[PDB]
From Swiss-Prot, chains A, C, D, E, F:
Function: Component of the proteasome core, a large protease complex with broad specificity involved in protein degradation. The T.acidophilum proteasome is able to cleave oligopeptides after Tyr, Leu, Phe, and to a lesser extent after Glu and Arg. Thus, displays chymotrypsin-like activity and low level of caspase-like and trypsin-like activities.
CDD domains given in the database record: proteasome_alpha_archeal
Notes on activation and inhibition: The formation of the proteasomal ATPase PAN-20S proteasome complex, via the docking of the C-termini of PAN into the intersubunit pockets in the alpha-rings, triggers opening of the gate for substrate entry. Interconversion between the open-gate and close-gate conformations leads to a dynamic regulation of the 20S proteasome proteolysis activity.
Subcellular locations according to the entry: Cytoplasm
Organism: Thermoplasma acidophilum (strain ATCC 25905 / DSM 1728 / JCM 9062 / NBRC 15155 / AMRC-C165)
PROSITE patterns xref list: PROTEASOME_ALPHA_1 (PS00388), PROTEASOME_ALPHA_2 (PS51475)
Single biological process term from Gene Ontology: proteasomal protein catabolic process
Annotated Gene Ontology cellular component terms: cytoplasm; proteasome core complex, alpha-subunit complex
Family in the record: Belongs to the peptidase T1A family.
UniProt keyword terms in alphabetical order: Cytoplasm, Proteasome
Segments forming a coiled coil: none
Protein name: Proteasome subunit alpha
Predominant localisation class: cytoplasm
Subunit structure: The 20S proteasome core is composed of 14 alpha and 14 beta subunits that assemble into four stacked heptameric rings, resulting in a barrel-shaped structure. The two inner rings, each composed of seven catalytic beta subunits, are sandwiched by two outer rings, each composed of seven alpha subunits. The catalytic chamber with the active sites is on the inside of the barrel. Has a gated structure, the ends of the cylinder being occluded by the N-termini of the alpha-subunits. Is capped at one or both ends by the proteasome regulatory ATPase, PAN.
Curated annotation (Swiss-Prot), chains B, G, H, I:
Regulation of activity: The formation of the proteasomal ATPase PAN-20S proteasome complex, via the docking of the C-termini of PAN into the intersubunit pockets in the alpha-rings, triggers opening of the gate for substrate entry. Interconversion between the open-gate and close-gate conformations leads to a dynamic regulation of the 20S proteasome proteolysis activity.
Catalyses which reaction(s): Cleavage of peptide bonds with very broad specificity
Family: Belongs to the peptidase T1B family.
InterPro entries tied to this protein: Ntn_hydrolases_N, Pept_T1A_Psome_bsu_arc, Pept_T1A_subB, Proteasome_bsu_CS, Proteasome_sua/b, Proteasome_suB-type
Record bears the keyword Manganese: no
Keywords recorded for this protein, A-Z: Autocatalytic cleavage, Cytoplasm, Hydrolase, Protease, Proteasome, Threonine protease, Zymogen
Stored Pfam families: Proteasome
GO molecular function terms noted in the UniProt entry: endopeptidase activity; threonine-type endopeptidase activity
General function of this protein: Component of the proteasome core, a large protease complex with broad specificity involved in protein degradation. The T.acidophilum proteasome is able to cleave oligopeptides after Tyr, Leu, Phe, and to a lesser extent after Glu and Arg. Thus, displays chymotrypsin-like activity and low level of caspase-like and trypsin-like activities.
Name the record gives this protein: Proteasome subunit beta
EC number(s) given by UniProt: 3.4.25.1
HAMAP family referenced in this protein's UniProt entry, alphabetically: Proteasome_B_A
A biological-process GO annotation: proteasomal protein catabolic process
Length: 224, 203, 224, 224, 224, 224, 203, 203, 203
């Protein structure tokens, strides 16, 4: 009941308790478009003393894999650094990052381990990975148990369910990049406009063939 | 021993002799030095026998595990990089071998790897004891505008020159052409004897 | 009562609790036919955002052993990867995968270990393995304690008992492949048609001599 | 009270709880005859989908030592494999399996260890070993504490006590093989004919000098 | 509830309890100015027997990174020494301390570890780091979970909230050094003038290009 | 109270609980005579299926040290094998078994360790050692704490106290071997004749200078 | 020393001399170099004695454990691959031995393994000090259309030539024929002396 | 082999030959010895092939991880210090290589690193077998008041002198100019042939 | 040194000289090289003294532990296999020794073990410096139809020939006959002097 052992009926209570820990985080989402994929994190810069642009929740794992996280921010940073060095290991060994699915699977195995053993709590963090590989655009989710699922569009955070409802209704598969980031912002709006404000969010995109591009402060307000 | 690998237009032809010695004393008149390493790429052997067969077992295993985990074949640059890292993680208890791995992914390739793990591309390559002879004839006759039949004729003429002018090589030549359309196909010995009797190399 | 130690009467409570965890999973089944064996997983693609065909629960262990799993999906992926590298170890050592029973036995020993020791919970996952070896077609089950049993036809998941009842009545030993996959789909139907829908399931087969063939989306709907 | 530590009066509660776990298993027995020894396991093939002959509870440890087990089947398989590799160690070291008593003693030391230490439960399995060595025919028992005892005839499983009562009355020491397997089947009958069925059991024998012979399906029904 | 495992709803109770341990400490703060950054610790020299100037809470990590701490003073000294040797590791490896963010991230990973594992309590200490790198002036916070945030001005200690309220109202971004240390002292005053005394505080500054300068006793009283 | 830690007043509860575990065993005893020492175990062969003579509780440690045990029989066999290999270590190192007291002391240190540490229960077994060395005939006891005491005559088991009372009254120090084994059997009788039967016991002797002699079945019945 | 192994139609014949030296100084006029390694396959020894007997003990153990765990015999490719991996996991504290393992599973095989673990198939093979002589006579007289009797006569003529023309070999020849029907049967010394006196090789 | 690196006003030009041997026996008439190691710095290779390709893979990985973690490129002093610590952590199982890493951060640099890891700056440097020839011509003709075109002409004249007067070098020269404005740009082979035919070095 | 072991009808006779050197310089005119290793088997020593005495201590210990655990003696094949595995687990820090272990279980045996652990049976064997002499006389005079008295006379004649024609051997001969009936009995020196004076070998 108080460490990763099984329930009276088939539940891992600590891994549940980690999922409600990642429900308490900041919302973020991502979606594929016609020839790439985008990630938009809400960034709700609370005080004016925070160095707005220098805090980044969309972090790069490689020039061809990015990640946005939600949950406990410390476990987030540690796990994202593990993903970075694992991508570097595959660059050293095989010469290129052939599959981004292998990269999410190794990180998810790392999370499964601390789901599995005693003497350690699970990673209370959830992530979504985005990028192109040889196969094409991929968008993955990652769960405190280490569960991965592949999406065309997904969410994470406090606005998990509201955003996923909007995506469940209004997502169109093949979509130009401009209308894609517009649909993503409308998703982020409908959920986060319960504090009656959104802000400028942070958003990155790739189209297949090019490297990574994170927007600047000025460009996102045009779509806002 | 001798190996040969040729990249041409949309294909790669790799052939070896089959004579293993293992002593001075040629001992096995029919060995096996041409290995299919994956459904679109193969590997040839020109070194110490035991170490190289261990290498072939390991690379078959790793590429099959790769194709299973990723549902796609491995690229040729990746398999040569993997093979180079394997040979260079241990070089002070070293493998005395000269590997040559060819194959096609979206363009044909044949890569050469020395005993220290220096992977390098070339449009045709050869390894082994009777290797400078086939480099001579491939320097004199090879053109990149060949078909598959002219290519395999060139390869058989090459290995025939190496069998004529070298002690360590010999035995029945075996050839495998790997192309994207029909995949990896190793020629039967009847067609090989047919090309030998046609090209005027039989004695 | 709360770790793998014995009961007041002869029960391992955690390994039980793992068996009810694998009762909460998705159903799947498999059966031998005249010269091979098939595995059909139900795949119930819930949302439209899931990349339907790219999530695979029938996963290959070797070109001559396949596996379909049920239970906790993270423990599933980790254990299936252990089975993959163990099959590769036997390919390196002996030259070929001579017995698929050895492959299920090593994986089941791995599950028995975390059934045995403290400081770790049992693997809450159940699997069935299928394929031909030198002996012929084999179909195995694997249990959270590490129990293996050999079948001609078996099931796993939420529809364990209903499917096993249908198989217990209507199974015929030597059966052509077409009527075999039809009987398997009728089995999967009778259980899973309590939500009054089935979907297109996923199904793979081998006939002895050939390699592996997983169906595509179009072929399974003909038998549906 | 809940790990292998002592009682308020001289009991190991977990090793008891393991003994009631092996009381919940399938019955089996064995007996010496005039120049060899036999092992008969009841095999109660429950469903028709179980591959009747391929599940084997009489398993070979060497060409001159066999074993039949009862209790948790996973711990059974792991312990039997330990016995196999230990017999192989003695073949490598000394050249031959000179004493089968050494082989049961090493396995029983392995069981005593997890009776002894914390952080691990005892092996909930009981076995009987049979075979000839240089000394002659031997038949051993093995207990969840690691207790060994040597018999002329013994039992294990759910029908422990009923079978041992019949053996206690009706055993004759020097006995031809045919009447021996008949007496063994009568023993297995009297206990297991409470579900008013027996089935074909599985039974193996050795006479001193020859190797191992496990019966086929047809031969055991003549004595049934 | 009593070690770093998750809550009934998403809380790490020990890491909370560490945050209330660092709320019980001595207050300190820091802020960027036009071309550098300052750190002012309150130093409340309680008895006259304490060697006033020789106790230092603003401690140097490198000639181009300084740190002031709050919370348990022993955990403070140990963690500050870890930061010192980590900065020295980066000097040995790369030749210079290129990013001060890397330095706060390694220390925060060290704190995340004892947030993560059992058999160890979290570091009950909070720190702020200040200094210039190649990027420019940086000011970081560090939290018992290992959370880092970048500020233009921040606080820590018993007067966390009161000081942060004053900074939230009255901070101006680009500010000459004299008016900067005056604003910082007014911040430290408004909070700590509840015991109706402040004292001479301790305060250090850097302007980009120069090394470190800690004030002496005489200079701080001019701004007091 | 439930592991080897101290009492509210000076007791090791687990080592007590081990002493009541060895009170539940089979009785045995030993005594010096004029030029040697004897060990008599009661052997109460319960069923007729037990291979009467092949179960041995008087076991040899060396050709010049023997041992008879009482308590948990599995811990007995493991500890006796430790004593065997320790005697062999002293034969390898020094050339001969000069002191049998060193041999009982090393075994008793082995028992003290699992009396001392947590994560392991004490050895619930008691032994008596007998034999001649360079000093002469020695007879030792060994206790679940590792306590050793030297006797001229001692007992162990269920008939500890009754036998020790008879020995306390009727022991004569210098005694010929025949009258010695007669006195020992009278001791074993008076205690064990509460089930109104004794049986043939097992008994071994040494006279100083000769090797070991265990009686056969026929010789002990003459003294019975 | 000398060994010989011949694959013919549905059988494989392996024979050795029996003379062990262990010094220059021939010391044991009746050794044992032909070992049954499993109920349908055997192994011959041509190296350092102690290392090779350790190898025979290990392979008997591993193949018996295999047959027990799987209820079927091991294939010949698997036992040579196992033996090659064993010899090649340690080659810098190496085994100085030349192994030759023959047997039948669904088709007869005889595989040669050097000290570095290079497993290679051949239809007849030989190892040891007096090996080129039996390669000479097996190059001149062997046909694959032989029976078992003509095969064992060829083998005895071979080892007789090696005993006549080499110092290290000698002693009484022992032969074992392994076939699928009758299994592994080692010929008694009376039939061996009968074939020696019949073929006109006795002196 | 031969490499050359020149620092001039706001640029750094690095060029190599392309001929890899790997034997005496020149084997690959088109290798790759000029590697882009990061978006503003490159690395040239003049040693054992396998070890140096492992070094290039590791430095690409470490500098890409660096740029990702810090959102800025690594300085040239830092990459040479890193490379020196890497080569000097293991020098008794050593790398037999001579590395030369050039690039621009706020001022152009080209640093030379020997096999023992002695990083040292110079305004022009060269490594390899045919290195003293290009040191001769760069001692005689180089001025720091050059443009980029005069610099790349000097570099091609240098490597042409080394190809004329040395056996180990040869093959088609490849050149890359790295500057702060346009970044790292490797010249196509058409412009290289144009400069060769213009400067009167073609034969 | 010299040892000798003879298997005859139901007995085995093992004898040694007693002269230990340990230098050139014969130093100990009465050593001990014949050791009883178990109640029905013995061991003789012909190598480096310290290593061999460690071997004797270990084998006494292991066989006594064996007899205690199993209530039966160890077979001779088992003790030679054990001794071979012991000597062959360490051969690169090796024991320079030549062991000879004889004994009777159900049939008499005498096994020879070299420094590499090659156990091999023979009906008579000898080790040591003066070993070819006793092999000569045992080749000329030994018959397997001997009694015990003719056997021990043959053994004393053998070791007397070795003492006459070799520097390293010498000293008083000690002999032990091990048979199944009377067990292991070492002859007293009075009977040995009696046989020496009877056979006409005293000088």
């Amino acid at each position: 009941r108080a460490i990763t052992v099984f329930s009276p009926d088939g539940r891992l209570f600590q891994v549940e308790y980690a999922r409600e820990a990642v429900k308490k985080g900041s919302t973020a989402l991502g979606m594929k478009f016609a020839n790439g994929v985008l990630l938009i994190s809400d960034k709700k810069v609370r005080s004016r003393l925070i160095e707005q642009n220098s805090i980044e929740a969309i972090q790069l794992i490689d020039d061809y894999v990015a990640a946005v996280t939600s949950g406990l921010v410390a476990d987030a940073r540690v796990l994202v650094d593990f993903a970075r060095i694992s991508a570097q290991q595959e660059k050293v060994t095989y010469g290129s990052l052939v599959n981004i699915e292998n990269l999410v699977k190794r990180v998810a195995d790392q999370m499964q381990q601390y789901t599995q053993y005693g003497g350690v709590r699970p990673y209370g963090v959830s992530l979504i990975f985005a990028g192109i590989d040889q196969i094409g655009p991929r968008l993955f989710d990652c769960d405190p148990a280490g569960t991965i699922n592949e999406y065309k569009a997904t969410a994470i955070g406090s606005g998990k369910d509201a955003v996923v409802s909007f995506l469940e209704r209004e997502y169109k598969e093949n979509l130009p990049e401009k209308e894609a980031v517009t649909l993503g912002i409308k998703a982020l709006k409908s959920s986060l406009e319960e504090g009656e404000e959104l802000k400028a969010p942070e958003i990155a995109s790739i189209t297949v063939g090019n490297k990574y591009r994170i927007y600047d402060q000025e460009e996102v307000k045009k779509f806002l | 021993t001798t190996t040969v690998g040729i990249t041409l237009k949309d294909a790669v032809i790799m052939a070896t002799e089959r004579r293993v010695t293992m002593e001075n004393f040629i001992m096995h008149k029919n060995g096996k030095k041409l290995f299919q390493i994956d459904t679109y790429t193969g590997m040839t052997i020109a070194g110490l026998v035991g170490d190289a067969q261990v290498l072939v077992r390991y690379m078959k295993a790793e590429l099959e595990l790769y194709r299973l985990q990723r549902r796609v074949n491995m690229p040729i640059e990746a398999v040569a990089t993997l093979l180079s890292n394997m040979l260079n993680q241990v070089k002070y208890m070293p493998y005395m071998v000269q590997l040559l791995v060819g194959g096609i992914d979206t363009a044909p390739h044949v890569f050469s790897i020395d005993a220290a793990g220096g992977s390098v591309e070339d449009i045709y390559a050869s390894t082994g004891s009777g290797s400078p002879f086939v480099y001579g004839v491939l320097e004199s006759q090879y053109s990149e505008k060949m078909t598959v039949d002219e290519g395999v004729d060139l390869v058989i003429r090459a290995i025939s020159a190496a069998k004529q002018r070298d002690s360590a090589s010999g035995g029945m030549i075996d050839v495998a052409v790997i192309t994207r359309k029909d995949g990896y196909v190793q020629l039967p010995t009847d067609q090989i004897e047919s090309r030998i009797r046609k090209l005027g190399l039989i004695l």
